[PDB]
């Protein structure tokens, strides 16, 4: 063809775009892609935070300060959830003077989400949390909805309520923020470029989007071990652990993940080890005949998940026992995950 | 037993509607068109192969000049192509690569896309800086963005796996009108030519006609046995076609309020991803999981032709406003232009 001068310059631009696309493509083909799945609150976004902390030198002091309002909001909502559950369960305060504090709590909860935690609100929360009737309700939290980090913050209210409060990395790791849509982070480790994707808030039919992740290197499936004793909801079909098993069954055996490694994070082992001391595993699995030790109960849960694999002879599940908020544990486990990925390809 | 009294009343209303529909089914489209000649030899050839995506292509949309088009791929790129020369005009790097839809604004000033980020991102093609910039991230859906179409530079309609569609004010970033009533993921939407109505197809196996300015569902169309993945208006705006996981396409008429025709072959059992009419409405083009595009005679239901040029699912297609070409986009990372 005999191109005009502007046409020639447009072709030249297109060829430059092509060189960029080719280069981007070479980098992308080297990526190790990790897909984080699991029920809401299983610990997925906490694992993402840990990758930033461990491999991206993330959550500096200055970034941690932006989580102050979230810490406060988590703290306030937790004590409110407990107070509201007392009216529902007919639990009375250990001291009748706390009824005023409870009224004030809802009133002082008209302050915005800023640097709140006025000394007045903090004192109202500290007195309620110390009340024996509130503690009795807190110890029945398996009967309502309550952030797993409730005790963590409320037990540290003195440090947290100081006007010079600077959130720690563990404070940040303990926060609960519900989001929608895919959450992503990238990092380099042992000369592999990792891209980790947390599907996150996704209210839709899995069958319509799961094929998009055909070709990911590995799935990390998070399970909240401590969900095992949660009372059924109003119209809930099965308990939370069985809903997790249903999701895992669907994922592990999906035709689109045939050449994808399945990694199982049996998470919140720290909370599970405390709960199993007082709440038997038969609440979750009525047929369970073992003892309620951490070791036996954790092994049984692992078995229940791994038995869902319909292709045991051709596919292997890599199970880890994790505390997602514990940076050293996640570092050690992800190191092992990485070695397995290296040895397998 | 209030829920009992209501659940039974809906069954009677469905029966009334079925009876009203049967009452005006005085003939079938097939018998009405029996006399007209078949279309015959539809021999379309690939006139262009658009190369440069490096992963599955999930969506495309022609600009209204019938020359530029935008395509969206899981390689994290939104590419605007000059289809006449195959020159890449822009290659836009996406913040999230898990895209499912893109759209070209009729003005040519903006494109949109989105996917598993649950966000409809608006991209300004005419910046002072000379490159393409995200001008808005439309947030508020709680499931994936499955489809979107601009009404003009300040309003856009979206469909989502969260079972809603929404009309957005792009300037303010707010959903200003919502379209609720589907009970399963909404997969696809199509704007009427006058933009006063749009139709949606969902995983409740129904299609719904929506009144844009009133914000409600005018009509609901059933008949499909599985998800409706794709939907497109007939060019005069009085009918539309769907494409389904049940391996059929179907033609629905608005004013007669019912299905008119099914397009299927007994040995075609795979899903349909995409549908489009030719300019006159005579041809219904549909993209299939079996890597082919089938061309149906929309009036007589015979298959007229095949476009077989991809090595993986045909995921999207579109016909230019001037009618001169059809584009196919594919999981095999290529787009092809045919006529």
């Amino acid at each position, epitope marked *: 063809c005999t191109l005009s*001068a502007e046409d020639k310059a*447009a072709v030249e631009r297109s060829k430059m775009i092509d060189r960029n696309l080719r280069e981007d493509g070479e980098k992308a083909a080297r990526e190790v892609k990790l897909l984080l799945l699991g029920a809401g609150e299983s610990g997925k976004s906490t694992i993402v935070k840990q990758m930033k902390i461990i491999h991206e030198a993330g959550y500096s002091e200055e970034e941690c300060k932006q989580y102050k309002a979230v810490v406060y909001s988590n703290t306030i909502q937790s004590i409110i959830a407990i107070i509201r559950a007392m009216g529902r369960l007919k639990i009375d305060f250990g001291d009748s003077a706390r009824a005023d504090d409870a009224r004030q709590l809802f009133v002082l909860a008209g302050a915005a989400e800023e640097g709140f935690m006025t000394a007045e609100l903090a004192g109202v929360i500290k007195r309620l949390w110390k009340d024996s009737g509130v503690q009795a309700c807190f110890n029945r939290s398996r009967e309502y909805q309550l952030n797993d980090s409730a005790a963590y913050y409320l037990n540290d209210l003195d440090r947290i309520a100081q006007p010079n409060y600077i959130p720690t990395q563990q404070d940040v790791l303990r926060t609960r923020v519900k989001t929608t849509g895919i959450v992503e982070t990238h990092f380099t480790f042992k000369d592999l470029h990792f891209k980790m994707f947390d599907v996150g808030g996704q209210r839709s039919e899995r069958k319509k989007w799961i094929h998009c992740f055909e070709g990911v290197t590995a799935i990390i499936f998070c399970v909240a071990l401590s969900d095992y004793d949660l009372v059924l909801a109003e119209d809930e079909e099965m308990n939370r652990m069985h809903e997790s098993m249903k999701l895992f069954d669907s994922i592990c055996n999906n035709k689109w993940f045939t050449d994808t490694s399945i990694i199982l994070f049996l998470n919140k082992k720290d909370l599970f080890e405390e709960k199993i001391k007082k709440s038997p595993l038969t609440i979750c699995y009525p047929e369970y005949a073992g003892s309620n030790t951490y070791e036996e109960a954790a092994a049984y849960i692992q078995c229940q998940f791994e038995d869902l694999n319909k292709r045991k002879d051709t596919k292997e599940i890599y199970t880890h026992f994790t505390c997602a908020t514990d940076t050293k544990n996640v570092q050690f486990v992800f190191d092992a995950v990485t070695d397995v990925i290296i040895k397998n390809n | 037993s209030e829920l009992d009294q209501l659940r039974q009343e809906a069954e009677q209303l469905k029966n009334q509607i079925r009876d009203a529909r049967k009452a005006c089914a005085d003939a079938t489209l097939s018998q009405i068109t029996n006399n007209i000649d078949p279309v015959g030899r539809i021999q379309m050839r690939t006139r262009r192969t658009l190369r440069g995506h490096l992963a599955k292509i999930y969506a495309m949309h022609w600009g209204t000049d019938s020359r530029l088009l935008v395509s969206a791929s899981q390689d994290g790129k939104l590419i605007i192509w000059d289809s006449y020369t195959t020159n890449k005009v822009h290659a836009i790097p996406l913040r999230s690569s898990w895209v499912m839809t893109c759209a070209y604004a009729p003005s040519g000033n903006y494109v949109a896309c989105g996917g598993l980020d649950n966000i409809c991102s608006i991209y300004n093609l005419k910046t002072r800086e*000379g490159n393409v910039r995200v001008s808005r991230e439309l947030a508020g859906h709680t499931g994936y963005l499955s489809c979107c179409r601009f009404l003009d530079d300040n309003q856009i309609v979206t469909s989502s796996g969260d079972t809603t569609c929404a009309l957005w004010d792009i300037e303010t970033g707010q959903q200003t009108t919502t379209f609720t009533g589907h009970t399963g993921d909404v997969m696809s939407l199509s704007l009427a030519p006058d933009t006063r109505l749009f139709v949606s197809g969902a995983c409740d196996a129904s299609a719904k006609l929506w009144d844009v300015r009133e914000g409600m569902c005018r009509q609901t169309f059933t008949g499909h046995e599985s998800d409706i993945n794709a939907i497109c208006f007939f060019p005069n705006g009085n009918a539309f076609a769907t494409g389904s996981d049940d391996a059929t396409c179907r033609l629905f008429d608005l004013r007669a309020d019912q299905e008119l025709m099914t397009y299927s072959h007994d040995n075609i059992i795979c899903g349909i991803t995409s549908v489009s009419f030719s300019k006159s409405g005579r041809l219904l083009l549909a993209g299939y999981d079996d890597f082919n595009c089938n061309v149906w005679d929309a009036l007589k239901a015979d298959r007229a032709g095949v476009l077989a040029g991809h090595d993986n699912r045909v995921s999207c297609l579109g016909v230019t406003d001037d009618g001169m070409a059809v584009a196919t986009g594919s999981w095999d990372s290529f787009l092809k232009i045919w006529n």
Partner: single-chain antibody
Amino acid sequence: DVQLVESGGGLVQPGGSRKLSCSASGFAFSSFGMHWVRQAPEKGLEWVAYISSGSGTIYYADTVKGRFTISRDDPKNTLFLQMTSLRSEDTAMYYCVRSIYYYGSSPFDFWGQGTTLTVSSGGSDIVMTQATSSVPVTPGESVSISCRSSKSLLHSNGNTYLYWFLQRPGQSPQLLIYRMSNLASGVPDRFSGSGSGTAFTLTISRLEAEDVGVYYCMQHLEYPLTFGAGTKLELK
């Protein structure tokens, strides 16, 4: 905010050397082709050199080949013009101009403020013709400026590669029309361009105050790029 700031001008003896610089900010510098256009003291615009985006393509005007070198430093967002063997005919204001080329783009849409260079004492090209050198006008009236080319500027692709610029008194040229009929961004709809092949017309409706200045046409069909002599709009 798009900025192009030329520097390096000054007084130089004939036969000497001088490097001009053009510093870019507020846009994706490396995506744009870049030109140098110069203007002798009481004269029109003359294209000097071009370096494409990516530096793959470089063109010089004949009167400058061998002596001037155009280069760019994309990481430092800078355009250069290295001049040598400076002659008296090089005395001019030197403009840096950005130009991006893709389907539907608007080339030549931003010009720098210019830097002044003064040198002391001691055919096949397309000809663009504006036969009328000046025109007196009164506000509110309607004007028609004319331009002609020695070759057809209408290409087999359908585009006609004709540009109109306005230089207001004391300011840099401003793009008005690209490819004979497209209104540049920010230009009021009272301007419009038309023509066919070898004859073109710029028309202003209800001429306003700011419209006074010199109007140049330019062909972008082929290099060297060439301007008309310019038509001035005087107030009555």
